[PDB]
RNA sequence: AUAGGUUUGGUCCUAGCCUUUCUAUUAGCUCUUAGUAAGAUUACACAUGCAAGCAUCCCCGUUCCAGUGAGUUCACCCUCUAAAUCACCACGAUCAAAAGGGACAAGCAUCAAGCACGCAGCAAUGCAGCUCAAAACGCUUAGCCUAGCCACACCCCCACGGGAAACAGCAGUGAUUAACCUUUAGCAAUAAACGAAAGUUUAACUAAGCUAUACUAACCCCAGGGUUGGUCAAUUUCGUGCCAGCCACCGCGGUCACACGAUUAACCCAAGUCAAUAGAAGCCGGCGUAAAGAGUGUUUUAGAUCAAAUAAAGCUAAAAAAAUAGACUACGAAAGUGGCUUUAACAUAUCUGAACACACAAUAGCUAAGACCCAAACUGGGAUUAGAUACCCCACUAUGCUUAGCAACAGUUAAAUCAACAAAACUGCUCGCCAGAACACUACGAGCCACAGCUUAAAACUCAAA
RNA sequence: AGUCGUAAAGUGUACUGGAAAGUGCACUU
């Protein structure tokens, strides 16, 4: 087999084209307001987004404008707000504006999530912090809005098997010589339904490459 | 040959098999260069007409017209088609009767 | 490198498409044979570089066109023929 | 093949070609309806319109599906082990790359050598090795092993770069070919993408359009195509007269043509028919006379069971080459060896196996020198009928001389021995050879020659014989 | 084709300038 080495040189010069010409957010989430669209790809964004684009702020949009670009401080979303009435909020720890920004309104930030009242062990990375969703929290209103009384989340700890399974699980105990009048059931207690909206882990997102 | 030796040999192989006049195709077309007749082998005797044409594949082939009486000229279009006609030798195309210029025999 | 000066040139009558009329000779890189059509005179314009000469030739393989195959795509070039050894 | 026709004055054998059967494409002529299946000749060029979105922004997808068959042992199995899915804490399962081992098309030896193709050592370096007539190396051909798989995605194998401006996605078009489907609808089903989801998108797909290409079922009325000398089912009357014309093979036509043209009738198949083309379809048969087996011995990786010679020295009798013995049949591998003496000396405890290894042997034809008694083609001379004798006689060359060169082996006679003719048939085992005439014909050319002569060929092509 | 006329011996090879075939060398019955 000839080898191919016009494969290899393209493959090489390619990967050093992308590791020298990697987009920086203030490119990559800039979108201009009038026609709600990505100026760097030229792709509009979806409809359902467009009142918020308008009316809301990223989080270093408001981050640029703290001390020490608001470490310490408590930021909500507006969906959280609407959707949850239990406090939601990350309390940043770490925050790396995007410095070429003209305004510093880009960059990455971590924290501790506190979702539905209830805060997690670790800090992490924010996901959507591109988004125009962010509030601050006042620090005179924090007490009032921290504040959070666990109720009581008892749910249900076992379901019963589908009809055909029951009856085959209860099948195969009595040709096994059991006589157990027990019902079958299935254990769920273990299987936390996770909201759909909960924040994922922003370090094992990707990112959009540079064209 | 023993059994060694058609072990040794392996399967009969056939020769591939000769193309003939149409290079393995039904029927050829045709440019006709020249009308004229030819005389049989002789256990028989006639006039047989023929017509030199050159086909799609650039060859030139003389090629036999059946049927009493054919219009065929210079630089008409016809289709031909396989088949030795037996009392010429060396004609081995045949002329397809009503198709492109070449019509078909006149009733009677 | 010198620049290629130019040469005009006419062909006689083509002598048919398998016969060539003239080898265009570029000193000792090589020739190009041209077959016009039956009864066609061609005008060409050959450019060598100006401290060397082109030559017109008749033919030193004048029945070279045959050896070819058929024209690829629509590609002007026609498909290469290993010629037979010697 | 359950075979058939065709070589001859006739019989038998051998052998080619063709017929009968089943498919596919195309063409002629002819075609009513319904359901289903399948559907450019071209890796040639393409106008136009569509074929990828989704989603509260991030991401994800557009790397799939769909297409083609240009190139061509990347596909399969085992080992190891990424990415992906689910466990989602991984234990690990599933799926499957890269890498290591194995396997994996056809023709041509008129492709026989390849030319670094190997090993050992931590390395330095050392050894000289590796593949191959059991087919290496090379050229040509082709998508394949089809629940599908492989390869490609305009070209430069690749695609940074360049040529250059791309339907081998759907519909459609130009050119080309014997080959020729709508520039329909919908995401209602399934599949894919995205979304938490209601859902959205999709020329995948689904449902339609066209086409006797095929299958199935019809049809009250409505059938065509071919054939009719034999192979092979089936002709009346005229017309024509070796002309016109016809045939798959053999063949018919010259005044009574079942073979051509028309007409009548019959036969076969039938919404078809059947002209051409291409496939399906074939070596366990033979080698004295038909195509095919001897010059001798040795060896050779394997396979099988069948474990009076010759050379040297001397010597000679009758008239250099050897009468009698020899009515002998020995020696030697063969060719060959038969005067006497002496000296060396006559391989091998199974068989088959060489173009290519070593020894011999014979047969042509030329080349160098050498001898020359005798004979002697050619070449001269003499004698002879009434085209003498072609033929007798003389002389003398090449040459005759001498060097050096260019079916096997072992067992059987039991069986119907037994196409014939030879030479009574047989088995087993191995090697070589054979798949019409055709060891045909032919000089495109090549060499020598140097304008006009000589030497040197296969294949096509044709035929139904030989 | 008639329309036309008539009833010792061999095989090879070489040379042949008195070649309707001859001679030379080797073979066969
Ligand atoms: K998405
Ligand atoms: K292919
Ligand atoms: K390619
Ligand atoms: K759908
Ligand atoms: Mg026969
Ligand atoms: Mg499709
Ligand atoms: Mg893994
Ligand atoms: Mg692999
Ligand atoms: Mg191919
Ligand atoms: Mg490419
Ligand atoms: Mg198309
Ligand atoms: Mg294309
Ligand atoms: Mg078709
Ligand atoms: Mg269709
Ligand atoms: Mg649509
Ligand atoms: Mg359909
Ligand atoms: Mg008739
Ligand atoms: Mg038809
Ligand atoms: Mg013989
Ligand atoms: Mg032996
Ligand atoms: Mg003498
Ligand atoms: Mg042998
Ligand atoms: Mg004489
Ligand atoms: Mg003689």
């Known amino acids: 087999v000839r080898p191919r080495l016009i494969a290899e040189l393209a493959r090489r010069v390619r990967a050093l084209r992308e590791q020298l010409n990697r987009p920086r957010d203030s490119q990559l989430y800039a979108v201009d307001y009038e026609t709600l669209t990505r100026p760097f790809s030229g792709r509009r964004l979806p409809v359902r987004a467009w009142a918020d684009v308008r009316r809301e702020s990223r989080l270093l949009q408001l981050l640029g404008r703290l001390p020490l670009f608001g470490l310490g401080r408590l930021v909500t979303r507006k969906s959280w707000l609407w959707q949850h009435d239990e406090p939601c909020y990350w309390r940043l720890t770490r925050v790396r504006p995007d410095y070429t920004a003209q305004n510093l309104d880009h960059g990455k930030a971590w924290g501790i999530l506190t979702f539905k009242g209830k805060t997690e062990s670790e800090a992490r990375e924010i996901e959507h912090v591109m988004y125009h969703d962010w509030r601050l929290v006042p620090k005179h209103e924090e007490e009032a809005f921290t504040a959070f009384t666990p109720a009581p989340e008892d749910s249900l ?55 | ?87 010429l030798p060396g004609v081995k195309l045949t002329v397809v009767r009503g198709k492109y210029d070449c019509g078909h025999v006149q009733k009677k | 490198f010198p620049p290629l000066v130019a040469e005009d040139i006419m062909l006689k009558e083509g002598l048919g498409a398998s016969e060539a009329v003239a080898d265009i000779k570029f000193s000792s890189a090589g020739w190009v044979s041209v077959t016009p059509n039956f009864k066609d005179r061609l005008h060409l314009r050959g450019y060598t570089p100006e401290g060397t000469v082109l030559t017109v030739r008749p033919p030193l393989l004048p029945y070279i066109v045959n050896i070819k195959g058929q024209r690829i795509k629509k590609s002007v070039a026609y498909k290469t023929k290993k010629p037979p050894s010697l």
């Open chain 1, 157 to 211: 700890a076992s379901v019963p098997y589908p009809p055909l399974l029951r009856a085959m699980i209860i099948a195969e105990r009595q040709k096994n010589g059991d006589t157990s009048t027990e019902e079958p059931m299935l254990n769920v207690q273990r299987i936390r339904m996770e909201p759909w909206d909960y924040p994922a882990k922003q370090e094992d997102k990707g990112r959009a490459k540079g064209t």
């Open chain 2, 1 to 87: 040959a023993t059994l060694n030796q058609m072990h040794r040999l392996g399967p009969p192989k056939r020769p591939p098999r000769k193309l003939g006049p149409t290079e393995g195709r039904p029927q050829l077309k045709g440019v006709v260069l020249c009308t004229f007749t030819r005389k049989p082998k002789k256990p028989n005797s006639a006039n047989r007409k023929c017509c030199r044409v050159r086909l799609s594949t650039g060859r030139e082939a003389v090629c036999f017209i059946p049927g009493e009486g054919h219009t065929l000229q210079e630089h008409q279009i016809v289709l031909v088609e396989g088949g030795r006609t037996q009392d």
